[PDB]
Every structure is written in C-alpha cells, then in structure tokens.
Design a protein. Structure first.
Length: 130
C-alpha cells in the first residue's frame, strides 16, 4: 500500500507515535517519506552486508526482524520480516518503536540525519488535522 501523506499522519497518531521516546510525529513522517515514499511493500537489498530493509520504515533484517537468509542476524523486534510488508502497519510501528528504544533513537536511520535532522519538518504534517 502507498499511503497518502495525511492519511499516514493520522494513522501514526492513532498508533501512539506522537512523542514516542521524544520523537515528534513530523519526524516519523519525515523518516517514512525518505525511507520508502510511504510504501509498505518497499524492500531494499544491501549487497555489501547481505541484509535487506523491509517496509515503510525500512527496518533491517540483521537486527530487528528475521528473514532467514541474513548472515549473523538477530531479531530484536521479534518478528518475521514478512510482517513488515503488510498494508496494515501495526507490526511495522511496533518494530520502529523497538528500534528507537536503543540509545541512538531515531538517529539509527542514516536517512534521518541527512534529510530530517536540524530541518523544518512541519511540512510533513501541515494540514492533516493531527
């Protein structure tokens, strides 16, 4: 599923993402936009380390979900990576919450530093009613 901007904003709010571990809704929106373009079936293979990023938040198979083919992998969020490719993003949200529970926080995603950090991110939730 490819979410529309405000539709995603409201969904994330309903799922308790606004202010989770000090992370504003606008930041989570900025993250989803650059990671997948709000696309829940997005997948990206990392040839260099043989891991794959899954779903709307591009969650990595080496630490957060299990896909069986990732060398020396772990499953911190305790989920099959398959769960992160559904249209319903509840499992992807629970996984993202788990990721930011580690000290790095939202900084765990390099895309967030490059495109979101220290920027005006209001534009991502403007007009959505959240």
């Amino acid at each position: 599923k490819v979410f529309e901007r405000c539709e995603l904003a409201r969904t994330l709010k309903r799922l308790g993402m606004d202010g989770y571990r000090g992370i504003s809704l606008a930041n989570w929106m900025c993250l989803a936009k650059w990671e997948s373009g709000y696309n829940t079936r997005a997948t990206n293979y990392n040839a260099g380390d043989r891991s794959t990023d899954y779903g709307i938040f591009q969650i990595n198979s080496r630490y957060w979900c299990n896909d069986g083919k990732t060398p020396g992998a772990a499953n911190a969020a305790h989920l099959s990576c398959s769960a992160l490719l559904q249209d319903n993003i509840a499992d992807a949200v629970a996984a993202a919450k788990r990721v930011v529970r580690d000290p790095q926080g939202i900084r765990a995603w390099v895309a967030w530093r490059n495109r979101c950090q220290n920027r005006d991110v209001r534009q991502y939730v403007q007009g959505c009613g959240v």
